[PDB]
Nucleic acid binder design. Structure first.
Ligand SMILES: Nc1ncnc2c1ncn2[C@@H]1O[C@H](COP(=O)(O)CP(=O)(O)OP(=O)(O)O)[C@@H](O)[C@H]1O
Ligand SMILES: [Zn+2]
Ligand SMILES: [Zn+2]
Lengths: 214, 56, 30, 203, 98, 56, 119, 286, 56, 49
DNA sequence: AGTACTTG
RNA sequence: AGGA
DNA sequence: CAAGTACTTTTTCCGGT
């Protein structure tokens, strides 16, 4: 039994957060699917000795009905969990051409400890398709759930066009969100993409800010 | 223009460089401050513009 | 402090490393 | 801030306190000693004769590392000799042979032997131990304190009512990790270093 | 303050001469493991040697100054714990009468 | 102070002014009040500059 | 610890193992000198030190006027004359426990209402 | 009612303001901060009472941090770049065997704690084993260097004689006197390092001297009298075979006391200003 | 008032005892250091707190 | 019982300026640091000549 | 009294 | 060197 | 590479060396 039990809890925690992030991005995910108990996760992805088989976890996600209205060209996503603590160029090229062939738009790679700089050189390799690296350890807790974290909302190319027209702005003039911002990472924000931030106000009760991506 | 004793030129050149340097900025890292015959150093143009008291 | 300087210290400075190839004897203060 | 349920649970508070507050082998140690004890099956030290007798029944170096641990320190920072030893055992793995006196036993001792030129190598292993070994807690987190902060919460009847909770105040910062810890509210967590908050939680 | 004064600056030699002629081993001859706890004597941060019975020595120096034989502006301290007897003929030391 | 025996931790030694201004202070009380008071005059002088530049 | 020096040189002694007869020696690294170990102990650390609590207890400890006096009877001679102080070990942690020195026999005793010493 | 204690320089009442200073020839230990290689330092600002006044300061340093392997004691010498391990200095002084070196530092043959701390120093200074190779090791590290085997050994001799611990003696044969003091510094260093004594209070009034009107004048007068000395040489040299400028002394005194700029001369900063001021006469008490 | 002065005088006297009580206790090794404090840090906090309680 | 010396007068701890203050032991310490700087801005007879 | 900078 |  | 170094903006506005 020992302290193997904790890495199990931690992997399941991280999984829930990935499911959460994927739903939030605008992909068809169930609430029952997110809230899958610890007990259910065990007898699904654990081998003959109750040790988690991450290769099984890896899933595909299709846009919600609503998502295709705002972002029509939003393709399908691939989420890849690896069982090797260090991910090598060998297992990377596998997943890279997996996306290229299955003609996915986006692809997330959740790794345990590291990704070799050998494998890292293959990330921008397949355009127009896009790849995202994610340390499992960071995914244990969903930052978006925090007290201090407001609702960020990705804007459609037409919505940004309107935001700028309506406020008589140049792209310079808007507040910026860094491409590496935890929330810009959670939503998979691309350069130029704008977020509408909705915070509560002790002043007005509700205040809408905007941040352009870097 | 006259009798050019080759080294004597790289000498007078380096001195002209110094004067044109210390005219614009007297307070340079490379320590030797251009001091007025009185020990008091020369007021650089940069010195005239430097913060609180002085031009800006 | 001043008195100590005139009475003692002055005669010390006057002949501590004074002597030159010309030495200096007793000092008188008017 | 503790998990939503365990608000008045002072014991849950003590559990996280111990689980997060950083402890090193140095903090527990009284003194480390180097002895020339050539036969490993017998011992020049008479006190230890008892420890050899058991940690044998139910090839290595003739140079010994013997460190005495403090009882009172193994208490305020709750500790078992087993859990202390197991750390040392798990650091050097199979490059060191570790024996330890029981929690019951009058004096608290840890006997270490290595797997030409030795004297200096063992004196190197002692710093790698005192300074470089962590037993409990997370790095950068020091003197953790239990506090009974007064909290206002709506009651079943609707009125806002004083329902205080157990809270932990740190004397160091490492947001990245203390968040992942089981038994807390990683939705309520706050650090005065805003440089850190922006890094972990976004602008 | 109204009572304060500053040390003018006296000559150490009559004290150095006095100490040696009052039981002082010169530092050159000192042997740390022979005479061990010998109180070490200093005159303006210059270690001149040691003395086996400072209790007697401190009393002789104290009563020399108090009589007028040792200049009154000279300061002498006996740290029994650290085993040191430090004397100051030094100029600039602020003193007060008591 | 030299008017105290060594290893004295008592309120009187560590600077507790038992007396009121109406009653007057003892020489020890006086000097301790003085040490404390002077600390204020220093921190006003220090902060008055820090604070001005923050505003700038 | 308590270490020795080499006769002939005076230079300090470094350990050496005699694997054949399993015994500790001490070689001189200036000359060819060697001698068997006195103790099996070669190094001692001491993290929670107690050595320096009663330093400078020179028999003149009474002649220091700056020191306070108490009416505690000596554990040995039963004398109510003593000069006391706190642990002369200059660390933060240190307890406030007093050390009394008799003004007749000069025996050292504490106020430590927990522990029984000899230092 | 007028008390005096002031001067009259060109018709004005000038006062010499007493200048505070840290006392000279005093051994003090200070715990050098957390992000430093050195953990503790034994400093001594050694100056001669009168005689050019050498502002040469000896630093006996304890390298390595608290809980770092190999804590060595090295000393910085006047006109020597590198930090020499204590042992070499003792050997350079004639004290050759470790144990005779250890006798000078640790006074108790019982105290193992202090001695354990000295073992690394012995290990460091092991390479050098005689007085000669010790003076060469110090001589090698300049100054600059000054290449020649006979030269460097001849130097370190002079530095230890004239420059190292210049109070006590600047004279020849006093190796034993200086070596017992270096040992006293290392003892005071380890006493603090082993938490037996306190780090010196750099704010203790006893370790401070107020330079009054007299010494202030002496500092100025010596500067000037030696400036007259170089002029006496210039006239003697020009006399390839009684005109000695009295102005230099008069003027310099008059300058400093008038300006308050305790230096030489109208070409001041860095010198020392604010020393001499005009005597307040608003109230008698003022 | 004279009675109010008696009352104040005895208020300080009791505080001074309460302090001495914790002083004898800490010198007899009986004091139990507060979690995250020296044994001394613990004592001083108590001394300072009784003296201030009194002043008020 | 160990007294080596005695204080001539404890008011001698004060310098010229503070010494002109009536009852300074009845004032808040800075109020004295103040008056010790004001008497230098006062007016009177500074010398009879 | 701090910060990027600079030089060992 | 002083002033709020 | 790091320690220890220099600079810098280091509160404002009001008799004369
Ligand atoms: N160096 C400085 N720079 C700028 N303003 C200053 C100053 N010194 C004093 N002041 C101003 O002068 C005001 C008065 O300070 P003080 O003259 O010392 C009397 P006080 O401190 O206000 O106490 P009080 O009203 O009970 O007597 C301050 O509040 C401040 O605005
Ligand atoms: Zn030998
Ligand atoms: Zn007795």
């Amino acid at each position: 039994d020992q302290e193997n039990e904790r890495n199990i809890s931690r992997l399941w925690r991280a999984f829930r957060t990935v499911k959460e992030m994927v739903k939030d991005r605008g992909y068809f995910i169930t609430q029952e699917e997110v809230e899958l108990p610890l007990e259910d996760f065990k007898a699904k992805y654990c081998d003959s000795m109750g040790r988690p088989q991450r290769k099984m976890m890896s899933f595909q996600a299709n846009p919600t009905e609503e998502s295709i209205s705002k972002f029509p060209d939003m393709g399908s996503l691939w989420v890849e969990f690896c069982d090797e603590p260090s991910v090598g160029v060998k297992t990377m090229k596998t997943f890279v051409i997996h996306i290229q062939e299955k003609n996915f738009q986006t692809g997330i790679f959740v790794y345990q400890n590291n990704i070799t700089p050998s494998a890292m050189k293959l990330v921008p390799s397949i355009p127009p398709a896009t790849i995202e690296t994610f340390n499992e350890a960071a995914l244990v807790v969903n930052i978006t759930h925090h007290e201090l974290v407001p609702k960020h909302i990705r804007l459609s190319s037409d919505e940004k066009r309107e935001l700028l027209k309506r406020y008589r702005l140049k792209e310079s003039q808007l507040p910026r969100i860094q491409r590496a911002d935890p929330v810009a990472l959670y939503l998979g924000l691309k350069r130029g993409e704008v977020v509408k931030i909705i915070r509560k106000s002790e002043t007005s009760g509700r205040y809408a800010s905007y941040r352009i991506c870097m | 223009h006259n009798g050019a004793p080759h080294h004597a030129i790289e000498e007078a050149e380096s001195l002209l460089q110094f004067h044109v340097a210390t005219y614009m900025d007297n307070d340079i890292a490379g320590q030797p401050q251009a001091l007025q015959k009185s020990g008091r150093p020369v007021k650089s143009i940069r010195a005239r513009l430097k913060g609180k008291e002085g031009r800006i | 402090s001043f008195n100590q300087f005139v009475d003692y210290t002055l005669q010390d400075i006057i002949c501590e490393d004074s002597t030159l190839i010309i030495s200096f004897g007793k000092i008188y203060v008017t | 801030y503790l998990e939503p349920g365990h608000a008045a649970d002072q014991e849950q508070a003590k559990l996280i306190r111990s689980a997060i507050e950083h402890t090193t082998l140095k903090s527990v140690t009284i003194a480390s000693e180097i002895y020339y004890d050539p036969d490993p099956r017998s011992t020049v030290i008479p006190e230890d004769e008892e420890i050899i007798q058991l940690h044998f029944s139910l090839q290595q170096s003739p140079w010994l590392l013997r460190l005495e641990l403090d009882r009172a320190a193994m208490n305020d920072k709750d500790l078992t000799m087993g859990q202390v030893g197991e750390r040392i055992k798990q650091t050097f793995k199979n490059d060191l042979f570790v024996i330890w006196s029981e929690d019951n036993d009058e004096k608290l001792i840890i006997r270490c032997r290595v797997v030409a030129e030795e004297d200096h190598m063992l004196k190197k292993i002692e710093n790698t131990m005192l300074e470089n070994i962590t037993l409990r807690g997370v790095e950068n987190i020091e003197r953790v304190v239990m506090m009974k902060y007064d909290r206002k919460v709506p009651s079943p009847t609707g009125e806002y009512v004083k329902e205080p909770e157990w809270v932990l105040e740190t004397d160091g910062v490492n947001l990245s990790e203390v968040m992942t810890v089981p038994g807390i509210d990683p939705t309520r967590i706050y650090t005065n270093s805003f440089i850190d908050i922006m890094e972990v939680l976004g602008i | 303050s109204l009572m304060s004064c500053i040390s003018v600056g006296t000559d150490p030699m009559p004290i150095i001469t006095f100490l040696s002629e009052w039981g002082m081993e010169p530092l050159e001859d000192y042997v740390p493991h022979q005479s061990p706890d010998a109180t070490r004597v200093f005159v303006n941060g210059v270690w001149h040697g040691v003395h086996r019975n400072p209790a007697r020595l401190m009393e002789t120096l104290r009563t020399l100054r108090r009589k007028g034989d040792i200049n009154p502006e000279v300061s002498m301290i006996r740290d029994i714990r650290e085993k040191e007897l430090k004397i100051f003929t030094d100029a600039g030391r602020v003193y007060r009468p008591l | 102070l030299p008017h105290f025996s060594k290893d004295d931790y008592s309120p009187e030694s560590k600077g507790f002014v038992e007396n009121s201004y109406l009653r007057g202070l003892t020489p020890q009380e006086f000097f301790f009040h003085a040490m404390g008071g002077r600390e204020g005059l220093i921190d006003t002088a220090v902060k008055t500059a820090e604070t001005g530049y923050i505003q700038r | 610890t308590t270490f020795r020096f080499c006769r002939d040189c005076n230079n300090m002694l470094y350990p050496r193992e005699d694997k054949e007869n399993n015994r500790l020696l001490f070689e001189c690294r200036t000359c060819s000198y060697v001698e068997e170990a006195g103790s099996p102990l070669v190094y001692r650390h001491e993290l929670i030190t107690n050595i320096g609590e009663t330093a400078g207890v020179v028999q003149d400890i009474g002649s220091d006027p700056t020191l306070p006096r108490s009416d505690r009877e000596c554990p040995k001679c039963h004398s109510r004359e003593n000069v006391f102080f706190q642990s002369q070990q200059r660390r933060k942690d240190t307890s406030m426990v007093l050390f009394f020195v008799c003004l007749s026999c000069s025996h050292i005793f504490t106020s430590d209402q927990k522990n029984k010493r000899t230092q | 009612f007028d008390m005096g204690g002031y001067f009259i320089i060109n018709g004005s009442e000038k006062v010499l303001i007493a200048q505070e200073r840290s006392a000279g020839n005093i051994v003090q230990v200070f715990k050098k901060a957390a992000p430093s290689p050195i953990s503790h330092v034994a400093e001594i600002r050694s100056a001669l009472e009168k005689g050019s006044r050498f502002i040469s300061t000896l630093q006996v340093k304890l390298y390595g941090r608290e809980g770092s392997s190999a804590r060595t004691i090295k000393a910085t010498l006047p006109y020597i770049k590198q930090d020499i391990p204590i042992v070499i200095i003792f050997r350079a002084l004639g004290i050759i065997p470790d144990g005779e070196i250890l006798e000078h530092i640790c006074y108790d043959v019982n105290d193992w704690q202090m001695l354990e701390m000295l073992k690394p120093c012995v290990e460091d200074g092991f390479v050098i084993q005689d007085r000669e190779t010790a003076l060469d090791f110090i001589g090698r590290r300049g100054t600059a260097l000054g290449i020649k085997k006979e030269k460097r050994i001849q130097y370190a001799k002079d530095i230890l004689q004239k420059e190292f611990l210049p109070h006590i003696t600047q004279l020849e044969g006093f190796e034993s006197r200086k070596a017992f003091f270096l040992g006293y510094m290392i003892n005071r260093l380890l006493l603090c390092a082993l938490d037996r004594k306190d780090q010196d209070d750099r704010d203790h009034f006893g370790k401070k001297r107020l330079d009054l009107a007299g010494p202030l004048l002496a500092q100025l007068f010596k500067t000037l009298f030696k400036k007259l000395t170089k002029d006496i040489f210039r006239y003697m040299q020009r006399t390839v075979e009684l005109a000695i400028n009295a102005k230099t002394i008069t003027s310099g005194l008059k300058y400093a006391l008038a300006t308050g700029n305790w230096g030489e001369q109208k070409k001041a900063m860095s010198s020392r200003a604010g020393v001499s001021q005009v005597l307040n006469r608003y109230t008698y008490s003022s | 008032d004279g009675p109010t002065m008696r009352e104040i005088t005895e208020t300080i006297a009791e505080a001074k005892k309460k302090v001495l009580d914790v002083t004898k206790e800490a010198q007899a090794n009986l004091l139990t250091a507060k979690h995250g404090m020296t044994l001394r840090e613990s004592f001083e906090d108590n001394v300072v707190r009784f003296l201030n309680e009194a002043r008020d | 019982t160990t007294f080596t010396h005695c204080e001539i007068h404890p008011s001698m701890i004060l310098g010229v300026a503070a010494s002109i203050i009536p009852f300074p032991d009845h004032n808040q310490s800075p109020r004295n640091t103040y008056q010790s700087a004001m008497g230098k801005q006062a007016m009177g007879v500074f010398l009879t000549n």
